[PDB]
Amino acid sequence: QQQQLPAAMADTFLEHLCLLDIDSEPVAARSTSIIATIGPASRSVERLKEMIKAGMNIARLNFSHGSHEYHAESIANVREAVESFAGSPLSYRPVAIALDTKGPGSGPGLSEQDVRDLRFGVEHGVDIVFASFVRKASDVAAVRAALGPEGHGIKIISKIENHEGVKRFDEILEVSDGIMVARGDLGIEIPAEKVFLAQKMMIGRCNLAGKPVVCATQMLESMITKPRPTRAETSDVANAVLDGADCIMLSGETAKGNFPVEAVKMQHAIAREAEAAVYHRQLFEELRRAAPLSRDPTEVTAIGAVEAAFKCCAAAIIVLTTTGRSAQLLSRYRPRAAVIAVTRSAQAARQVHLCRGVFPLLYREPPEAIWADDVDRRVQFGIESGKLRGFLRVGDLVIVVTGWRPGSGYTNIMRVLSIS
Amino acid sequence: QQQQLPAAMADTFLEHLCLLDIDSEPVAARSTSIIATIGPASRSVERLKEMIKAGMNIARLNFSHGSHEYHAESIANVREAVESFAGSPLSYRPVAIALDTKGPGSGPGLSEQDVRDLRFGVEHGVDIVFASFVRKASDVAAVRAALGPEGHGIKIISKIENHEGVKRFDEILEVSDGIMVARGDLGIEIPAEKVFLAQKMMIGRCNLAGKPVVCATQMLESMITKPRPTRAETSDVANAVLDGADCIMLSGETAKGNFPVEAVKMQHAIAREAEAAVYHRQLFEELRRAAPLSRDPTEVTAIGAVEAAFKCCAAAIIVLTTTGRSAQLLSRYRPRAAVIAVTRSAQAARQVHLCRGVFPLLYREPPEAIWADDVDRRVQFGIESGKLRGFLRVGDLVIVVTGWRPGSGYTNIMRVLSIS
Amino acid sequence: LGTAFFQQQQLPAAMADTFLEHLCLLDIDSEPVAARSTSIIATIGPASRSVERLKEMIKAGMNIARLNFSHGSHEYHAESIANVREAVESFAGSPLSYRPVAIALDTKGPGSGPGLSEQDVRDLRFGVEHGVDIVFASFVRKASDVAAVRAALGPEGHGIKIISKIENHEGVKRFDEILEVSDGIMVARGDLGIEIPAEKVFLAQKMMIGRCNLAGKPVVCATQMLESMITKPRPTRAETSDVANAVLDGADCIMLSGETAKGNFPVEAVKMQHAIAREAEAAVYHRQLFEELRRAAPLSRDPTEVTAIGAVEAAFKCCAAAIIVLTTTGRSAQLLSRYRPRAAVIAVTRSAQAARQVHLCRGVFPLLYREPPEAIWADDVDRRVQFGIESGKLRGFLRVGDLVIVVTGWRPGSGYTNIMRVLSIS
Amino acid sequence: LTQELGTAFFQQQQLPAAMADTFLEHLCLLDIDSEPVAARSTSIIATIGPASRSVERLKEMIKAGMNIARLNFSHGSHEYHAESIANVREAVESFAGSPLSYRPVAIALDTKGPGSGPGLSEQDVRDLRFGVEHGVDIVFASFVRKASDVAAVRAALGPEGHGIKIISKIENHEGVKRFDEILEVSDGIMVARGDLGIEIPAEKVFLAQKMMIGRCNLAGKPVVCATQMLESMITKPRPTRAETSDVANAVLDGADCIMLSGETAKGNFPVEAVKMQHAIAREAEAAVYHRQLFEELRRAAPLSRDPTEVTAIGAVEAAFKCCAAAIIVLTTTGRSAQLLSRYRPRAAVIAVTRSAQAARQVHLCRGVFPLLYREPPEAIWADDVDRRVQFGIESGKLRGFLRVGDLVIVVTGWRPGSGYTNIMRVLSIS
Ligand SMILES: CN(C)c1ccc(S(=O)(=O)N2CCN(S(=O)(=O)c3cc(O)c(O)cc3-c3cccnc3)CC2)c2nonc12
Ligand SMILES: CN(C)c1ccc(S(=O)(=O)N2CCN(S(=O)(=O)c3cc(O)c(O)cc3-c3cccnc3)CC2)c2nonc12
Ligand SMILES: O=P(O)(O)OC[C@H]1O[C@](O)(COP(=O)(O)O)[C@@H](O)[C@@H]1O
Ligand SMILES: O=P(O)(O)OC[C@H]1O[C@](O)(COP(=O)(O)O)[C@@H](O)[C@@H]1O
Ligand SMILES: O=P(O)(O)OC[C@H]1O[C@](O)(COP(=O)(O)O)[C@@H](O)[C@@H]1O
Ligand SMILES: O=P(O)(O)OC[C@H]1O[C@](O)(COP(=O)(O)O)[C@@H](O)[C@@H]1O
């Protein structure tokens, strides 16, 4: 069979490793979202469109370099390239816009420049903030305050860049929306030979907590100048996916390199192969065993849907979401099935890329008179969207996750549907 | 906590054994159905009513002793005592009627008397047939043929009573509806020291097949004369439940003994305690791992519902059934939650006692004009009944299993309900 | 390779990856070949006082002889000890087939008051004077009760093993403190089934056996195991079930109280208990049992404990017929037993008391070495090795090629075990 | 007063992370402050070239932890490689003054390959005969595609080259497909990712690496991870975040050896790359989840009636039970040490042998620390055995392996000869 299914059927992880096949082509859609740093090499509207077609999910704006005028233009080009595909909603791919802060610099609270960068992001409608150099939970609260009452929906991903941040990780993760393993600065503050330990630990604690985790810095570094990466670069990218990272990131690879689209395509290729090599048998059992009991129907429905999808090898789990939460809760159980999130919120659709295996679609049509009808219309939108994108074929089984009443947090239904 | 919950939380079976508490009272309803052999000591309509209140689920008619007139009278008195409780529809407990055949005696095929006995059972509306001395799959086919065209809906439980029956078990189970470990005759054909091996093997193979299994003969033998059983008798009963038997049975204990109701009450008491001592953590994992993948939504919904019920420690899994199949498929995954089956079929309600943890409700209310309304009215019937019988309290969580259109084999929905 | 050995003593059922597949692979035609591990304790009464009949019970597999001091005078029980030791030493002519038997004293109990009853003090002093090996302390409810029994033994009764009978609710609740100070536990289901609901007795049994297995201390299942056999020649289906399940639960010993003491079939009950125990031992799922027992056992800096886990692991790897261990106090063999190997722990000791007492730990087969000590200890141990090997070649335990694990020490005495060595037979 | 000095232990070398019941819990328990204390297991293979040819710099590489010296026969004349052998052996035997701290180094020959078309290359025949004549210990057979290719290399060595270990470099798709037959006839495998990354898609190389390492771990045969491990260190003093990651992951995957090519052969930081590979490998070994690794390795290993194999599993089990500092094994061929290594113990497998070749070759097995016993054989073998055993104890005492009060597992045999191992004995230090 295909997509490492004989390797996934193995009773032991050693058996699984021995059953890995280079000829077993991956068929599932690429789960681990790609974050591309936008710079001179990736700012043109034609090239940005190419990167979207290549699989860029999030666009990073590094506020360490660049003026507010430069970054406002970065956003416009990004938006314009994304919106050119709006004419065909069944194929429109949303892209999130993230702001990577410059950092507290001198050491104390939040830098004055960062307050001005954060209020700019709020004004320009950014979805995610990569908080540079977070060392404690008070640093996160300061960033949340710097966004104000308008920046409430914006996701805060804390960049762990030093030893203090690693030690105080649990308090930072509790108050953050997710973590970024910013290996660049981290490789300097702590010994370079200990960085993998911090990466693997953070990814593990994030997987345990259900919160997104981003692997960052020098993933395909040689591709800035060369058309093909090193054997260690392909290895690192594949291992970040195998470790359980929700996102993979490109810095100078897409910002100032000669091969921006090629780095995106390469990251996509490796991530797709690594996802099929995931030992879901033990991964799901351990994730389920580790997850505490829940009396929230959204969480209870998530584990039931993931279990049901595993049983029939469901091609996708279509979930109707409003804030992204239902999709995030399905993602935490790491299913082999694609979590197709259908939401009317464009912000939630962009943000849900931080979760692994979540494929957002934006329902652009107005709500129907009968809620039951409007719900079924969105389920069909996700079936039609997944059919033209290759996710679904006729005769496939899908798990459909819905709620009992309109509004966020009412998810409670899982239903087994047969395609067409 | 109560119902061996600290013992169930343990990561290892040894830790589970060490965590068993005598003071941890069981709270869940008694799953393992009790089959009581009706004889002179239990013929009384007055006494039958007491045994129904004591927890008798199935009434066995041993055709080795007794005339057709004697047994048609026993059935008439059983049904009289059962329909006396039909005034309260939320608390009406259905009882199945089983016919235990005399056996092939000599051997050319099915005995001449058995053909008459089987024709009688069909005419008298029996639900289950205990086929005595089954040695091959041809023996089962002969019994099904004997049940003519009318009797095609009677469940056939094959009594494995000899060495040939044990050897040819897999072919017999494939054609049977379930197995009875008839240890009486079995303990004579094969060495008495090897009977436990055959019992444990058959129960294991039946659990793996999802088919019911009955433990029979000398379970509380001393209680025929004495008011209290031996330490080995309580042990055997508890161990049959721990082994994974769907049903426990009383022969002379209830048919000709001085303590018929007391034996039923005692079997109930032991079974309730043994069910709380079940290590569901490994049991469910092994049962799930062993069960093959399925493209049947009834099957897929069952594993999703059982997984969702474990996650929240759901009070009960309310399933709407017609043939009892949906409830049986939930039972095979051995949930801690009570599978409350809500059916309009009187026969299916009686027969569903063969599956462990299935609590049937006969829905006598008239069909509503709108099917979705009728489904919800039936779903609420299960909630009303369980809540009345102590199964449910307000604020509890239940897993509700339904289907997309009316008619059997369309089950595909699992929905997390919060009581009242 | 062993052709018939593939379908043998539930080996296909033991090879299974899951316990459910293990249950499905159990075969009635797979005859057990290994020696019977779970020791049998027979209560000696009027039906079993006869020296002639005692000899039959020894040949039938009785390992320990119980003296119930609830009935009988000191003269009545001293005669029993003489009858027993007489039958015991009748087989001493052939030391290679010499089966030692332990003598246990079951106390009457504290009656109805705080402290050890006055009769119990006399009974315990009697046992010390008569050289009993084990004491079944009736109605133990706390760790102070055990200390009182140990004090009543005095300076002479130091080697005597104290098995605490848990017979009531207080004893069940205070189990961990009682086990810490006891040498082992008896699940005295008779009295226990009265103090706590009869439907909760199996819970207490399974818990105690589990905690004893965890602690490495012996555990005895007692009362009404083959109760119907007091009057009838064959037991009930529930009785064979209970006996088999006690073995499957992990009990080191099975007992016959009243089934041998006053029943028409004393030898037949012993033979039946032996037959069931042998079948149940082959049905043990050693794959998960050993993994769980190893995982649960704490790490140790004691070479006797470290050697035990290494020897049990080595025996599983090659399907060693037996693990021959050279003990002095029965500790090295007890430490091997706690890891529950499929191989027979053949204990070779010069201590007659330790040889009798080592019956309390499951799978331990004691062989009293009567030959005199050689001038060189580095010669003595090597001859003590061959003594145990030839007892297996006589008793059927071993055949040519049947590899064995040999457990010895660096110097002679108590607790200097540190060597495990893989030996090939002939 | 605050007598918890065993709190410092159990908190070092990822011991809290190793004690976890689940692999997720293990990942969550990994600590950057938990310093590794055990000796570095995964052997380092350094490619010798212009940057690493001087005897002076070779001595620093040996002190930095180089275990095997690779001679790439794709570049270089027979005169150049023979001079490299003299410079290497000269630098190695400079430390022979203290046998209790002498570190042996193996010499490997990496062949040029069959070139353009089937059959063993004509240059390779000359190269292989040269290696035999010059006493090489290992041969990295370039571009092995089937079991016949291995047999051709074994034949090309001749009757003299019988002890030489043959590590087959899997460099193409055919080699990956026909892996099981190649491993059966090879002494070990090299995951030569350089050539491999060209023959098969670059995104599928990790799959081939992880599969090969897994099958090698299953078979008990050594496995080497090769090509671009610390590539940026050829020019820069510090590696990339992906390079440290890849090195650590090769160890975590279960590779017995890690390798440096241009990194030491033609780079500006040869010693620094060796020191860096050592640093990462040491940290990655403490992060190994031995709890499931040992259970899976034991479960997967077939039952054996060979006492050498039975003693190995018993010794590894006994070492985990007491957290033995080291497992001292007496070996002649290196087989007893290899069989202990396959079960992947946390204890250091200290191999004591009188064979200089076996001592060099035993570096291919992970966690095997060879010490060459130069003392003369005693008249009675019985005494001589417990003095070679004591040599290992005194060697560990000096080399920081053994502290007083520690426990060691000692693995010996019943008679002098290969494969006669059958004894495991628990010894307390000093
Ligand atoms: C304490 N001692 C002496 C022990 C005895 C037996 C075993 S065992 O045979 O390996 N063991 C049997 C019990 N199961 S299990 O409980 O998870 C269970 C798995 C099923 O698949 C299955 O159908 C039924 C059961 C089951 C359920 C409730 C009570 N009883 C059995 C786990 C596996 C031990 N494992 O570790 N310690 C063990
Ligand atoms: C949540 N995330 C981060 C996870 C990722 C992957 C897996 S997994 O693929 O099932 N997983 C891989 C790691 N092994 S293992 O560590 O026991 C190991 C078993 C071997 O047989 C073997 O050859 C090598 C190893 C091994 C690998 C890395 C470090 N030290 C040892 C266990 C099984 C997870 N299981 O639970 N959580 C998992
Ligand atoms: O995933 P979230 O953010 O909790 O919200 C998902 C919600 O979407 C629905 O499926 C559809 O309802 P809406 O009309 O608000 O879109 C709800 O029933 C469910 O609560
Ligand atoms: O258990 P069964 O035989 O599959 O029957 C359950 C059936 O009953 C329902 O739950 C309700 O419909 P009806 O009771 O009107 O047949 C169906 O949707 C489902 O297919
Ligand atoms: O059973 P124990 O108390 O652990 O002792 C076993 C003893 O066996 C021996 O191998 C032999 O002891 P002896 O020569 O004194 O009989 C000792 O080294 C060890 O102390
Ligand atoms: O590693 P190998 O080839 O199995 O050799 C191990 C051998 O070493 C010894 O300990 C000593 O052997 P030598 O005297 O031949 O060196 C043997 O008893 C054992 O058989």
CSV table of C-alpha atoms in Angstrom, one decimal, chain A residues 86-331:
chain,number,residue,atom,x,y,z
A,86,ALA,CA,-11.0,34.7,-4.1
A,87,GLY,CA,-12.9,34.4,-7.3
A,88,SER,CA,-12.9,30.6,-6.9
A,89,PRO,CA,-14.0,30.0,-3.3
A,90,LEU,CA,-13.8,26.2,-3.6
A,91,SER,CA,-10.0,26.5,-4.2
A,92,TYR,CA,-9.2,29.8,-2.2
A,93,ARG,CA,-6.4,29.2,0.3
A,94,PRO,CA,-6.3,31.7,3.2
A,95,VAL,CA,-2.9,32.9,4.5
A,96,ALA,CA,-2.2,34.2,8.1
A,97,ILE,CA,-0.1,37.3,8.7
A,98,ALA,CA,2.3,37.1,11.6
A,99,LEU,CA,4.4,39.9,13.2
A,100,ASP,CA,7.7,38.8,14.7
A,101,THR,CA,8.7,41.5,17.3
A,102,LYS,CA,12.2,42.9,17.6
A,103,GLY,CA,12.6,42.0,21.3
A,104,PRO,CA,13.0,43.7,24.7
A,105,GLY,CA,16.6,44.5,23.8
A,106,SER,CA,18.3,45.9,26.9
A,107,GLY,CA,16.6,43.4,29.2
A,108,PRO,CA,13.7,44.9,31.2
A,109,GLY,CA,9.9,44.8,30.3
A,110,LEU,CA,8.7,45.5,26.8
A,111,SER,CA,10.8,47.7,24.5
A,112,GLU,CA,9.3,51.1,23.5
A,113,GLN,CA,9.8,50.2,19.8
A,114,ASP,CA,7.8,47.0,20.4
A,115,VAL,CA,4.8,48.9,21.8
A,116,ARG,CA,4.7,50.9,18.5
A,117,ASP,CA,5.2,47.7,16.5
A,118,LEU,CA,2.4,45.9,18.4
A,119,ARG,CA,-0.1,48.8,18.0
A,120,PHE,CA,0.9,48.8,14.3
A,121,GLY,CA,0.0,45.1,14.0
A,122,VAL,CA,-3.4,45.6,15.7
A,123,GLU,CA,-4.1,48.5,13.3
A,124,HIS,CA,-3.1,46.5,10.3
A,125,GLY,CA,-5.1,43.4,11.2
A,126,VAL,CA,-2.3,40.9,12.0
A,127,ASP,CA,-3.5,37.4,13.1
A,128,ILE,CA,-0.4,36.1,15.0
A,129,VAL,CA,2.4,37.8,17.0
A,130,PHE,CA,5.7,36.1,17.5
A,131,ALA,CA,6.8,37.6,20.9
A,132,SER,CA,10.7,37.7,20.7
A,133,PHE,CA,12.6,36.8,23.9
A,134,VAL,CA,9.9,35.8,26.3
A,135,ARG,CA,11.5,34.9,29.7
A,136,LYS,CA,8.4,34.8,32.0
A,137,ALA,CA,4.6,34.9,32.1
A,138,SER,CA,4.7,38.6,32.9
A,139,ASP,CA,6.3,39.2,29.4
A,140,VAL,CA,3.3,37.6,27.7
A,141,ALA,CA,0.8,39.8,29.7
A,142,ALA,CA,2.8,42.9,28.7
A,143,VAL,CA,2.4,41.9,25.0
A,144,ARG,CA,-1.3,41.2,25.5
A,145,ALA,CA,-1.7,44.6,27.1
A,146,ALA,CA,0.3,46.3,24.3
A,147,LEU,CA,-2.4,45.0,21.9
A,148,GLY,CA,-5.2,46.6,23.9
A,149,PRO,CA,-9.0,46.0,23.6
A,150,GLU,CA,-8.8,45.7,19.8
A,151,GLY,CA,-6.1,43.1,19.7
A,152,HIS,CA,-8.1,40.4,21.6
A,153,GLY,CA,-8.4,37.8,18.9
A,154,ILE,CA,-4.7,38.0,17.9
A,155,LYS,CA,-2.8,34.8,18.8
A,156,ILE,CA,0.4,35.2,20.8
A,157,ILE,CA,3.2,32.7,20.1
A,158,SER,CA,6.0,33.1,22.6
A,159,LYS,CA,9.5,32.8,21.2
A,160,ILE,CA,11.6,30.9,23.7
A,161,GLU,CA,15.1,32.3,22.9
A,162,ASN,CA,17.1,32.0,26.1
A,163,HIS,CA,17.8,29.8,29.3
A,164,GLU,CA,15.4,31.7,31.5
A,165,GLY,CA,12.6,31.1,29.0
A,166,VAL,CA,13.4,27.4,28.9
A,167,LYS,CA,13.4,27.1,32.7
A,168,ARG,CA,10.1,29.1,33.1
A,169,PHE,CA,8.5,27.3,30.1
A,170,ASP,CA,5.4,25.9,31.9
A,171,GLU,CA,4.2,29.4,33.2
A,172,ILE,CA,4.9,30.9,29.7
A,173,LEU,CA,2.9,28.2,27.9
A,174,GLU,CA,0.0,28.6,30.3
A,175,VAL,CA,-0.4,32.2,29.3
A,176,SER,CA,0.7,31.9,25.7
A,177,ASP,CA,-1.4,30.7,22.7
A,178,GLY,CA,1.6,28.6,21.5
A,179,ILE,CA,5.4,28.4,21.5
A,180,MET,CA,8.1,29.1,18.9
A,181,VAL,CA,11.4,27.2,19.3
A,182,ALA,CA,13.5,30.1,18.1
A,183,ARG,CA,16.7,28.1,17.7
A,184,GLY,CA,18.8,31.0,16.4
A,185,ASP,CA,19.0,33.1,19.5
A,186,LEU,CA,18.6,29.9,21.7
A,187,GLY,CA,21.7,28.3,20.1
A,188,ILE,CA,23.7,31.2,21.5
A,189,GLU,CA,22.3,31.6,25.0
A,190,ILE,CA,22.6,27.8,25.7
A,191,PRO,CA,25.2,25.3,24.3
A,192,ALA,CA,24.5,24.4,20.7
A,193,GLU,CA,24.7,20.7,21.6
A,194,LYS,CA,21.8,21.2,24.1
A,195,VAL,CA,19.4,22.9,21.6
A,196,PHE,CA,17.8,19.7,20.3
A,197,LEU,CA,17.0,18.8,24.0
A,198,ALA,CA,15.1,22.1,24.4
A,199,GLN,CA,13.4,21.7,21.0
A,200,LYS,CA,12.2,18.1,21.7
A,201,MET,CA,11.1,19.0,25.2
A,202,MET,CA,9.1,22.1,24.2
A,203,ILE,CA,7.4,20.2,21.3
A,204,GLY,CA,6.5,17.4,23.7
A,205,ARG,CA,5.0,19.7,26.3
A,206,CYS,CA,3.1,21.6,23.6
A,207,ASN,CA,1.7,18.4,22.2
A,208,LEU,CA,0.7,17.4,25.7
A,209,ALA,CA,-1.0,20.8,26.2
A,210,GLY,CA,-2.7,20.8,22.8
A,211,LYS,CA,-1.1,24.2,22.0
A,212,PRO,CA,0.7,24.9,18.6
A,213,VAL,CA,4.4,24.6,18.4
A,214,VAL,CA,6.7,26.2,15.7
A,215,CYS,CA,10.2,24.9,14.8
A,216,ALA,CA,12.2,27.9,13.6
A,217,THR,CA,15.7,29.0,12.3
A,218,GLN,CA,18.2,27.5,9.7
A,219,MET,CA,15.9,24.6,8.6
A,220,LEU,CA,17.0,24.9,4.9
A,221,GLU,CA,19.7,27.5,5.4
A,222,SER,CA,21.9,26.4,2.4
A,223,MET,CA,18.9,27.0,0.1
A,224,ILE,CA,19.5,30.8,0.4
A,225,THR,CA,22.3,30.4,-2.2
A,226,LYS,CA,22.0,26.8,-3.5
A,227,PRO,CA,19.0,25.2,-5.3
A,228,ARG,CA,19.1,22.0,-3.2
A,229,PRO,CA,19.5,21.6,0.6
A,230,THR,CA,22.0,19.6,2.6
A,231,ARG,CA,21.4,16.0,3.9
A,232,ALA,CA,21.2,17.5,7.4
A,233,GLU,CA,18.6,20.1,6.4
A,234,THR,CA,16.2,17.6,4.9
A,235,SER,CA,16.8,15.5,8.0
A,236,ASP,CA,16.1,18.4,10.5
A,237,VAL,CA,12.9,19.4,8.7
A,238,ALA,CA,11.6,15.7,8.7
A,239,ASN,CA,12.6,15.3,12.3
A,240,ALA,CA,10.8,18.5,13.4
A,241,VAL,CA,7.6,16.9,11.9
A,242,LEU,CA,8.4,13.6,13.4
A,243,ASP,CA,8.9,15.3,16.8
A,244,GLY,CA,5.4,16.7,16.6
A,245,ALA,CA,5.8,20.4,15.5
A,246,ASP,CA,2.6,22.0,14.3
A,247,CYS,CA,4.6,24.5,12.1
A,248,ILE,CA,7.9,24.7,10.2
A,249,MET,CA,9.6,28.0,9.4
A,250,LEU,CA,11.8,29.7,6.7
A,251,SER,CA,13.7,32.9,7.5
A,252,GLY,CA,16.4,34.1,5.0
A,253,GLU,CA,15.4,31.1,2.8
A,254,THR,CA,12.3,33.0,1.7
A,255,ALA,CA,13.2,36.6,2.8
A,256,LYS,CA,16.6,37.2,1.1
A,257,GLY,CA,17.4,34.0,-0.8
A,258,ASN,CA,17.7,33.2,-4.5
A,259,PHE,CA,15.2,30.2,-4.1
A,260,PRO,CA,12.2,31.4,-2.1
A,261,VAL,CA,9.5,29.3,-3.9
A,262,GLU,CA,11.9,26.4,-4.1
A,263,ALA,CA,12.4,26.4,-0.3
A,264,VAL,CA,8.6,26.4,0.2
A,265,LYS,CA,8.2,23.5,-2.2
A,266,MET,CA,11.0,21.6,-0.6
A,267,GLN,CA,9.7,22.1,2.9
A,268,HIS,CA,6.3,20.9,1.7
A,269,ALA,CA,7.8,17.8,0.0
A,270,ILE,CA,9.7,16.8,3.2
A,271,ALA,CA,6.8,17.5,5.5
A,272,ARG,CA,4.4,15.4,3.4
A,273,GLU,CA,6.8,12.4,3.5
A,274,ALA,CA,7.4,12.8,7.3
A,275,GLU,CA,3.7,12.9,8.1
A,276,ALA,CA,3.2,9.4,6.5
A,277,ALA,CA,6.2,8.1,8.6
A,278,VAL,CA,4.5,9.1,11.8
A,279,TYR,CA,3.8,6.1,14.1
A,280,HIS,CA,0.2,7.1,14.8
A,281,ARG,CA,-0.4,3.8,16.6
A,282,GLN,CA,1.6,4.7,19.7
A,283,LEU,CA,1.2,8.5,19.2
A,284,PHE,CA,-2.6,8.4,19.4
A,285,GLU,CA,-2.6,5.9,22.3
A,286,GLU,CA,-0.1,8.0,24.3
A,287,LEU,CA,-1.9,11.3,23.4
A,288,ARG,CA,-5.2,9.8,24.5
A,289,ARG,CA,-3.7,8.2,27.7
A,290,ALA,CA,-2.0,11.5,28.6
A,291,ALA,CA,-5.1,13.7,28.0
A,292,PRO,CA,-7.1,14.3,31.1
A,293,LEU,CA,-10.8,13.3,31.3
A,294,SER,CA,-13.1,16.0,30.1
A,295,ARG,CA,-16.7,17.0,30.8
A,296,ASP,CA,-16.8,19.5,27.8
A,297,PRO,CA,-18.7,18.0,24.8
A,298,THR,CA,-16.4,19.8,22.3
A,299,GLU,CA,-13.4,17.7,23.8
A,300,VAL,CA,-15.4,14.5,24.1
A,301,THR,CA,-16.6,14.8,20.5
A,302,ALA,CA,-13.0,15.4,19.3
A,303,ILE,CA,-11.6,12.1,20.8
A,304,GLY,CA,-14.7,10.2,19.6
A,305,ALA,CA,-14.3,11.6,16.0
A,306,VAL,CA,-10.6,10.9,15.9
A,307,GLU,CA,-11.2,7.4,17.2
A,308,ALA,CA,-14.0,6.9,14.6
A,309,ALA,CA,-11.8,8.3,11.8
A,310,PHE,CA,-9.0,5.9,12.7
A,311,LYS,CA,-11.4,2.9,12.6
A,312,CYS,CA,-12.5,3.4,9.0
A,313,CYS,CA,-9.4,5.3,7.7
A,314,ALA,CA,-11.6,8.4,7.1
A,315,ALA,CA,-10.2,10.6,4.3
A,316,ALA,CA,-11.1,13.8,6.3
A,317,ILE,CA,-12.8,15.0,9.4
A,318,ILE,CA,-15.0,18.0,8.4
A,319,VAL,CA,-15.7,20.2,11.4
A,320,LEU,CA,-17.8,23.4,11.5
A,321,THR,CA,-15.9,26.0,13.6
A,322,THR,CA,-16.3,29.6,14.5
A,323,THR,CA,-13.3,30.5,16.6
A,324,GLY,CA,-11.1,27.5,15.4
A,325,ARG,CA,-11.4,25.7,18.8
A,326,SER,CA,-13.2,22.6,17.6
A,327,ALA,CA,-10.5,22.1,14.9
A,328,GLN,CA,-7.7,22.6,17.5
A,329,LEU,CA,-9.2,20.0,19.8
A,330,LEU,CA,-9.4,17.5,16.9
A,331,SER,CA,-5.7,18.3,16.0
